[PDB]
Structure formats: structure tokens, C-alpha cells
């Protein structure tokens, strides 16, 4: 009849009136074994219904919480995540021998004391044998294959062993000795008949794959040619304490014993792989994004995807800014308001990252962007009430302060819990709901000292946890 959850007694009932209305037991009365048989099949059907509920949960990406199902849905959406980035530190180099050149050539390998591969991002220069350089945890892999048969949509597969550390990909097609670095456009967009184009994708078993053209749309590599996959890999945010020496290896091992390298800065600015839930959320928001850079939500989503580390971003369109300003400003025409907050970068820094990002991104047409600094709006909270006397008041106060900092702190994830460009603010209802979810106090009251309502453009309202007031008492039990 229905998919509503039944009850075992209801099933036993339906069975028993079915039995009694059936005439065969009427001719054969005295089957008290069918009683516990009905019981057993009732638990069987209950387990079956639980399985059906699991089927419903897995039949929807929103309801399914499995990495595999989420990846399958994301690939249907034709969306893929972001790779982890290397962590870079700042090091000093003092050669111990005169024969060592003061100019270290580009991309010399290095090993760390914690046995991690590191690579220079540029040419190191020694000022009379003394120099300084930034080096990140970077390593090299390469796979070469040769085409042997002719299939439309040439396909290449990768192994998780290397995709777990992959950060950057390079595709070379060597046809009859001529090697060309091919470009990639997703979903074969702007792909002509013979376009050097390929599409890369995930696969629910965490596989990585790439597909080539049909000749009609996308160039088909010829038979007998070779394909080269260069993979710049990293282990993520590998952080190491400063003040330790570095050992060159491989071809650099010759100068390893001739040159001394000592780090001066802890290795920072590394990112790791993003979580399953955030991948699911970005998958839904990319389904909204519709594989096109058109609107401000898409802009924010792309920018947050391309710039890790920012707390949140906000942007407003030409019409929105003009409505705010109350004028039909021609200067504001084709001008997009932007702003953002970063837990570690200033507003000017954020503005210059975003300006550089828009500069090196050519996916725009006469699109002018105006940045304004994000203005913080701290406010205090006075929580007054009585609590259970069984816990130490100091411990309760510390726990409350930690929870408030975690939830509605200056750099709290609450502002961007979805990481898809949807910046949200704090609400009095939200605060009271959070504290009720805590539920430690029996009765309580919140005073919102210097409470303000954000404009939504750049105002950054957050709780002043350290100046917050805790009129905590013990409620009689």
C-alpha cells in the first residue's frame, strides 16, 4: 500500500485477519506454529523495510552520504573537485665549497629531514655563496603510453596511488616525433574537428580518467603516436619546523655535500583534499552553476574554488549596487561590487589576490570589478542565567567560551558552512538555537550589546567572545 513505516504489530494483524478470512485455515484450524512463523517473517520484512529505506537514502545525492554515490552524482553533473596544494617554506642556503655555483639552476630536487620531496619554484641565487629561496613540497611523476588501436574517444586511466598526491597535470601528444602540449576544455566546449582538446573526470571508485575527441568534435590522436602524462604531486600541507637542514638528492646529491641549506621559516601555505560533504555541496552548487560563468553566484563559486584559504566572499551585481546607491551611475554600469574575508589575509591583500585572479582569468568580457574592504561589526553577548551545580563553574565558562568561539567566532565556519560562495550572517534566533542545543543552562537570557544588522555587502558581524559577559549561576537541583 504505502512506503510509510509500518509496525510489527500492524503486520502481525494484517497477517492474522488475512489468515482468518482465508478459508484454508478454516478447514485446518490448530496452526499455532504460523504464529511464530508470522513473528519471524515480521522481523524479516522489518529488516527488508530498513533495506528499502537505505535504498531511498542512496537513491538521492542529498540523502546519500557515501563518497562513492556522491562522486557518481558529481560525475553525472560533470563536476570534479580540487587537488591539494604544496606547502612552501622559506630557506637559506650557504654553500660550503667554492666550486658550488652561486646560481642554482631551475627545479633542483631536495629531500627534507622528515623524508619528503621538495622542489624549488625558481632559480636560486647566492650572494657570495649565501642565498634565500622559497621551496614547496613538490615531486614529479610521469607515465608514457603508445596508441595501438583506433577507438573513438581515446581514454586514459590513472591510479589512486598517484592521484592521492597529484596536484598538477600535463598532457603531451607526441605524434611521429612532434610533441604538443594539449589543452583541455570541459565537456568538449569550443572543440572543433581537430582541436587539441581532452576532458578529465573522476570516477566513483576514485579513478581518474581522460577522454579525447571523435574527430567530429575534438582531434583524434593518430595511431602509433604516444601520450605523456606529467604529474606534479604533493602531499598537501606538509608543515616542518624551521631551523633544520636540508639534504639535496638525485642529481643534486653531487652538490649536497658541497652546499649547506638551512630552513628559516616553518613550511606553510599548504592545502589538503576537501571533504566528502563539501564535495557533495559543491556538486549541487555546480549543478546550479550549469557549467557557465554568467552570474555573481557563479563568479563567487569559481573564485572560492580557485582561491583556497579565504574565509568567505561576497559580490553584488550592477543592478544591486545601483539599487543600493539610489542612482543610475554610468560609472557603476558594468561594475560589480566585490568583497571578502580571510582568516589570515588583510582586506588589501584579498583585493590584490582577487585583482590578480581576474587579470590572469580571461573568462570575462568588459567585466569591471570594484572591491571594497569588509568591515567587521563585533558585538557583545551577555548570557545571564542559572545552570546545574554539578559541574565546575570555571569549566562551564571555559566550555561556553570555546563553543561560542567555534560557532560564531570572528573566523568561524558558520559564515561559510557550504563553501560555494553563499556568505551568511549570524542571527539572534541562530544564537539562541545554538545555546539551547547546548542545553546546559536551565534558564537563561541573552543581551545583544551593540548588536548591529549587516548590510550584506561588506559588513562583518561577529561575536566578541572575549568581552562577552557570563552571569552564570547554579540552578538548585
Amino acid at each position: 500500500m504505502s512506503k510509510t513505516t509500518p509496525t510489527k504489530d500492524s503486520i502481525r494483524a494484517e497477517f492474522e485477519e488475512l489468515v482468518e478470512k482465508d478459508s484454508f485455515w478454516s478447514k485446518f484450524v490448530g496452526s499455532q506454529f504460523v504464529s511464530m512463523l508470522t513473528l519471524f517473517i515480521t522481523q524479516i520484512v522489518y529488516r527488508c523495510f530498513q533495506y528499502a529505506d537505505a535504498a531511498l537514502a542512496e537513491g538521492f545525492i542529498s540523502t546519500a552520504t557515501r563518497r562513492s554515490s556522491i562522486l557518481a552524482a558529481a560525475e553525472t553533473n560533470s563536476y570534479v573537485g580540487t587537488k591539494p596544494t604544496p606547502s612552501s617554506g622559506m630557506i637559506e642556503i650557504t654553500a660550503t665549497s667554492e666550486d658550488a655555483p652561486a646560481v642554482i639552476p631551475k627545479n633542483m630536487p631536495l629531500i627534507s629531514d622528515d623524508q619528503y620531496p621538495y622542489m624549488t619554484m625558481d632559480v636560486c641565487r647566492l650572494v657570495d655563496g649565501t642565498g634565500t629561496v622559497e621551496v614547496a613540497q613538490l615531486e614529479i611523476q610521469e607515465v608514457t603510453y603508445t596508441v595501438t588501436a583506433a577507438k573513438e574517444f581515446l581514454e586514459v586511466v590513472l591510479s589512486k596511488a598517484l592521484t592521492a598526491v597529484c596536484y598538477k597535470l600535463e598532457v603531451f601528444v607526441t605524434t611521429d616525433g612532434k610533441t604538443t602540449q594539449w589543452s583541455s576544455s570541459t565537456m568538449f566546449r569550443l572543440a572543433g574537428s581537430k582541436s587539441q582538446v581532452y576532458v578529465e573526470f573522476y570516477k566513483p571508485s576514485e579513478q581518474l580518467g581522460v577522454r579525447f575527441g571523435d574527430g567530429l568534435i575534438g582531434q583524434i590522436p593518430p595511431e602509433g603516436s604516444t601520450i605523456t602524462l606529467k604529474v606534479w604531486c604533493t602531499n598537501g600541507d606538509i608543515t616542518l619546523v624551521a631551523g633544520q637542514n636540508l639534504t639535496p638528492v638525485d642529481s643534486a646529491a653531487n652538490l649536497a655535500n658541497l652546499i649547506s641549506v638551512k630552513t628559516t621559516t616553518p613550511i606553510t601555505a599548504g592545502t589538503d583534499a576537501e571533504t566528502t560533504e563539501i564535495t557533495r555541496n559543491r556538486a549541487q552548487y555546480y549543478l546550479a552553476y550549469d557549467d557557465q560563468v554568467v552570474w555573481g553566484g557563479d563568479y563567487t563559486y569559481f573564485l572560492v574554488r580557485n582561491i583556497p584559504g579565504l574565509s568567505w566572499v561576497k559580490a553584488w551585481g550592477e543592478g544591486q549596487q545601483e539599487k543600493l546607491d539610489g542612482a543610475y551611475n554610468v560609472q557603476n554600469i558594468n561594475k560589480i561590487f566585490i568583497s571578502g574575508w580571510h582568516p589570515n589575509k588583510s582586506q588589501s591583500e584579498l583585493e590584490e589576490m582577487i585583482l590578480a585572479a581576474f587579470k590572469k582569468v580571461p573568462n570575462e568580457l568588459n567585466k569591471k570589478f570594484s572591491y571594497k574592504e569588509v568591515r567587521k561589526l563585533p558585538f557583545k553577548i551577555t548570557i545571564t542565567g542559572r545552570i546545574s551545580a554539578s559541574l565546575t563553574i570555571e569549566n562551564v565558562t571555559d566550555e561556553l567560551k570555546s563553543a561560542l568561539e567555534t560557532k560564531f567566532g570572528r573566523d568561524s565556519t558558520f559564515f561559510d558552512p557550504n563553501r560555494v560562495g553563499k556568505y551568511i550572517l549570524i542571527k539572534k534566533k541562530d544564537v539562541w538555537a545554538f545555546i539551547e542545543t547546548l542545553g546546559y543552562f536551565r534558564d537563561f537570557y541573552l543581551e545583544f550589546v551593540e548588536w548591529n544588522e549587516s548590510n550584506g555587502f561588506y559588513d562583518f558581524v561577529y561575536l566578541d567572545t572575549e568581552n562577552s559577559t557570563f552571569n552564570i549561576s547554579y540552578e538548585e537541583e
Binding site: 504505502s2 488475512l18 482465508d22 485455515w25 517473517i41
Partner: protein, 93 residues
Amino acid sequence: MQRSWFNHRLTSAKQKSLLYKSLADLVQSMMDTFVDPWLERITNRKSIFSMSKEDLETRTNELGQFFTIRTSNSSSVPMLLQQRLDEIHFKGT
């Protein structure tokens, strides 16, 4: 959704038996009432037009209620979403 389905791996005498038809048709009724509607909903989910209501508004509100039209033409909901999804390539106009 099965008629006399227990009529194939059963000897004919036990098929015409009194209680075996009782057990067979009771379990056929039980499966009809508590396994099959899941099969019907999954088969509806197979087709964009066949999807049951619950599935339709489920797919609707997975993204959010701000991306849809509050219409009572439930038969049109499948095509309306079909156009809403195939327009993404021409929705700058």
C-alpha cells in the same frame, strides 16, 4: 505484481494443496504491499516523465525552493523541469 508466481518450482499436487496456496497468496500479498511500491518508484525515477510526486519535489527541493515555480500543474512539473534543465545552455537570453 505476480500471479500464481509460486506455480513453477512446485509439484502440481502441492500446488493444488489447500495450505500451500494460502501461504503463497499471503506472501504474494505481503510483497505486493511492502516491497513493490519501491520498485514502482525506482522505475518512475528511471524516466523523467514517470517520476512519482515525492521524487519530483525531492529533486525540486534538493537544490532549493528558489529555483522552481510554484505550480499546481503536476503533469507539467516533469516537462517544466526538463526545460529548466535543458535551458542552461541558452539561458542568457
